[PDB]
Enzyme design. Structure first.
Site, PDB file in Angstrom:
ATOM      1  N   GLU A   1       0.706  -0.363  -4.950  1.00  0.00           N
ATOM      2  CA  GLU A   1      -0.148   0.801  -5.213  1.00  0.00           C
ATOM      3  C   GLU A   1       0.738   1.992  -5.055  1.00  0.00           C
ATOM      4  O   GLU A   1       1.320   2.229  -3.982  1.00  0.00           O
ATOM      5  CB  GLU A   1      -1.301   0.890  -4.273  1.00  0.00           C
ATOM      6  CG  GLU A   1      -2.029   2.222  -4.379  1.00  0.00           C
ATOM      7  CD  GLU A   1      -1.558   3.319  -3.409  1.00  0.00           C
ATOM      8  OE1 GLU A   1      -1.670   3.076  -2.190  1.00  0.00           O
ATOM      9  OE2 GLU A   1      -1.104   4.407  -3.854  1.00  0.00           O
TER      10      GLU A   1
ATOM     11  N   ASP B   1       0.864  -1.176   0.000  1.00  0.00           N
ATOM     12  CA  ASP B   1       0.000   0.000   0.000  1.00  0.00           C
ATOM     13  C   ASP B   1       0.918   1.250   0.000  1.00  0.00           C
ATOM     14  O   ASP B   1       1.954   1.218   0.618  1.00  0.00           O
ATOM     15  CB  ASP B   1      -0.908  -0.092   1.297  1.00  0.00           C
ATOM     16  CG  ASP B   1      -1.630   1.207   1.639  1.00  0.00           C
ATOM     17  OD1 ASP B   1      -2.400   1.672   0.774  1.00  0.00           O
ATOM     18  OD2 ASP B   1      -1.374   1.800   2.753  1.00  0.00           O
TER      19      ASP B   1
END
Ligand SMILES: [Mg+2]
Ligand SMILES: [Mg+2]
Length: 755
Positions: free
Chosen positions: A483, A430
């Site tokens: 991401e 993330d």
């Protein structure tokens, strides 16, 4: 080696197999050395020694017996290898079981660790059951170079560590063997820092932990608690390229998928434990164990037809409301759901059902909680000392010092840890921007630039490349998903071409275009046709993963249905159209729990999902829709063999903005697998809509998101449509189609059909 020695091994007469098996120095040359690796592999016909970090593979030879192997290798150091073993038609890859003679740290361990290259450091740091001076017990060790003193406190000494003071080695690591105790032992490190201040720490390499808000580590016999059954899955994964396969991921937060009653015990694998109450405000609810999840989540996912399950962070974390993104026990699966063996069981069972497991992994930061890593030895040890690079002030957390060798090693070995001991199939990281930039969420004058005056966080970039370099070498075949939200270049490209080494990147741009677009009243989508307009230039720079994630159905964004305009019938149609578009657009797929049955409310991490909705037909229909679409996705090569090549996609027409219709082809190796996709993003049906196709023939209506079994109006082409010889959209032949409202069709040439 001699036959007599081999025989002693084969028939169990040898007093110490470590003398013979494993890796042993034969001699030193000027710039190199000569090693032999030996292995007794009953039932293996063949074997190789892999040196994955040097990209080398050497075969082993049988010696005096068909199952006794050796392999002589020349190289200066032989720290990192694996054994590949062939029994019949099957291969497995494993670490050498005779790799470590002793439980205690050697000079060699310590040296490798200081350089940040000990890829198996978790075999020696932490707590391990073993034997020293002829007694069984537990060896503990912990990195704490600036500590004045360290002692082990636990159940076994009533939390008084005066008779269990550890011994500092090489000015860097503290160790102690404690006889007689074993697995189950509850413990912490008592540390005195340079100022005399005394305080307790959980074990950073601990393998299990008390249940939050308690923090004592617990000793685990990690190699003798679970028996695996997934060799075949691992072999299949090692020998395939996952980019060329269907990858549809069900994203799940284990703590809020489904709850149980706190009035009963938590069943585990051959055992049970006290319930873990989800909260003080919802005390009749408990979490399910990894064991109960294997029984319930896994057949659910299998029926839905997803290929992978992606878990929000399961490393040990003190606060439910972080979702897992603030970790304090990087080496243990959270005890909220039971024991390490229970999670092993969960992974083993996914693999038995042909489902892969991807972990959210959180190397970017860690919280200040005083049991965890912070200010570990009375210095800034794990975190960098300068707050302009060592704190995320807006998040209230600390940033690891990636340039410090033992910190890099902590993290790099950690990622490998989950692949080694828990057999996971991939990771996802993330907020990769948070590592990459020295100015991340930092105001002017409140950060400093790198040695070249740039904003790039060099150490972090270098750490990320090492992580992905080593993962793929040790475990080819895995997924490493990023991401990254700043258009950084070459995220999912190889490190040798200047990439970060991931093999997939979340398409955040695609996500925003999709949700901004479907949120607009249908009439007005004509002003935003660019959202639904594939862009060759951008798309082929990365291997994209199309993710509609948990982050998009919290904090006042609504769940998927709530995002959509119209009456109830239209809101559902919009969902079906968006997801049918998503499954046909190039890229892998990820969607979050609750999206597949049309949950109205936002995901709430403190409760479980609104399962009662599945009593009602609309929710049921939507779920059959996802079930069929996942089945479709797995059966149609053109939906997954060429997501990342030009060949895989061709736009047909993208200009009828006035009707918000878009159409395209997907292709695969066989031209007969080609698919024609047509999307109508308004509620206006169309009875004659001409679409160019590549060939004459009958095109089956293979999928129709307006079908009545999905809650649709059931408009369509009643089975399919013969192509007319009638040029259109620069294509020789063409179809005169009925387009259902707010719906997507997929058509496929049947070239064996009776004209
Ligand atoms: Mg005391
Ligand atoms: Mg509930």
């Amino acid at each position: 080696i001699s036959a007599d020695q081999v025989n002693q091994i084969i028939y169990n007469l040898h007093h110490d197999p470590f003398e013979i098996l494993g890796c042993h120095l034969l001699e030193e040359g000027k710039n190199t050395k000569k090693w032999v690796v030996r292995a007794y592999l009953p039932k293996a016909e063949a074997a190789w020694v892999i040196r994955p970090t040097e990209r080398k593979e050497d075969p082993m030879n049988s010696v005096h017996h068909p199952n006794f192997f050796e392999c002589i290798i020349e190289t200066p150091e032989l720290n990192h290898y694996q054994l590949k073993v062939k029994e019949g038609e099957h291969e497995k890859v494993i670490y050498d079981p005779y790799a470590f003679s002793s439980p205690y740290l050697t000079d060699e361990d310590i040296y490798l660790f200081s350089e940040g290259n000990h890829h198996r450091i978790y075999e020696k740091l932490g707590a391990h059951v073993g034997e020293i001076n002829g007694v069984k017990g537990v060896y503990f060790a912990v990195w704490a170079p600036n500590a004045r003193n360290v002692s082990v406190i636990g159940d076994f000494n009533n939390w008084d560590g005066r008779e269990h003071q550890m011994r500092k080695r090489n000015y860097t690591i503290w160790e102690l063997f404690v006889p007689e105790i074993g697995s189950g032992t509850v413990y912490k490190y008592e540390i005195k820092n340079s100022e005399g201040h005394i305080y307790e720490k959980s074990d950073p390499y601990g393998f299990y932990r008390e249940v939050r808000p308690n923090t004592a580590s617990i000793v685990v016999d990690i190699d003798n608690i679970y028996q695996w059954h997934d060799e075949e899955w691992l072999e299949k994964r090692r020998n395939s390229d996952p980019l060329k396969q269907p990858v549809s991921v069900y994203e799940v937060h284990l703590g809020s998928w489904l709850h149980g009653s706190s009035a009963e015990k938590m069943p585990l694998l051959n055992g049970e434990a006290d319930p873990v109450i989800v909260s003080e405000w919802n005390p009749g609810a408990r979490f399910l164990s990894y064991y109960e999840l294997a029984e319930k989540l896994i057949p659910y996912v299998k029926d839905m037809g997803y290929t992978h399950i992606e878990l929000l962070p399961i490393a040990e974390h003190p606060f439910d409301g972080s979702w897992g993104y603030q970790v304090t026990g990087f080496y243990s699966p959270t005890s909220r759901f039971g024991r390490p063996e229970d999670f092993m069981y969960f992974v083993d069972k996914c693999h038995e059902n042909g489902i892969g497991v991807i972990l959210d992994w959180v190397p970017g930061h860690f919280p200040k909680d005083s049991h965890g890593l912070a200010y570990f030895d009375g210095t800034h040890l794990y975190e960098h000392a300068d707050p302009r690079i060592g704190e995320h002030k807006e998040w209230g957390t600390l940033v690891f010092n990636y340039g410090r060798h033992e910190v890099r090693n902590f993290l790099v070995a950690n990622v490998l840890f989950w692949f080694d001991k828990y057999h996971v199939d991939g990771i996802r990281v993330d907020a990769v921007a948070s590592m990459l930039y020295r100015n991340y969420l930092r105001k002017e004058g409140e950060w400093i630039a790198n040695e070249y005056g740039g904003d790039e966080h060099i150490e972090a970039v270098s750490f990320i490349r090492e992580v992905n370099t080593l993962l793929f070498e040790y475990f080819p075949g895995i997924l490493s998903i990023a991401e990254e939200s700043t258009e950084w270049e070459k995220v999912s490209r190889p490190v040798y071409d200047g990439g970060l080494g991931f093999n997939l990147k979340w398409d955040m741009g695609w996500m925003h275009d999709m949700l901004d677009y479907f949120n607009i009243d249908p009439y007005f989508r004509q002003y935003h046709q660019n959202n639904v307009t594939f862009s060759m230039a951008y798309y082929y720079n990365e291997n994209f993963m199309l993710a509609l994630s948990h982050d998009e159905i919290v904090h006042g964004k609504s769940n998927m249905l709530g995002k959509m305009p119209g009456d109830e019938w239209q809101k559902y149609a919009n969902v079906r159209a968006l997801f049918t578009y998503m499954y046909t657009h190039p890229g892998k797929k990820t969607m979050f729990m609750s999206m597949e049955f049309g949950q109205w409310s936002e995901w709430n991490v403190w409760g479980d999902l609104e399962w009662h909705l599945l009593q009602y037909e609309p929710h049921q229909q939507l779920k059959q829709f996802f079930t069929d679409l996942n089945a479709l996705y797995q059966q149609e090569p053109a939906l997954y063999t060429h997501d990342f090549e030009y060949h895989g996609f061709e736009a047909i027409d993208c200009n009828d903005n006035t009707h918000s219709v878009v159409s395209f082809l997907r292709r695969s190796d066989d031209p007969n697998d080609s698919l024609v996709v047509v999307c109508n993003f308004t509620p206006q049906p169309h009875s004659h809509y001409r679409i160019g196709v590549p060939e004459a023939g009958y095109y089956v209506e293979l999928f129709n998101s307006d079908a009545k079994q999905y809650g649709g109006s059931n408009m369509g082409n009643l089975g399919g449509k013969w192509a007319d010889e009638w040029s259109f959209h620069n294509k020789p032949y063409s179809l005169d189609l009925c387009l259902p409202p707010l719906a997507v069709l997929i058509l496929k040439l049947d070239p064996t059909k009776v004209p």
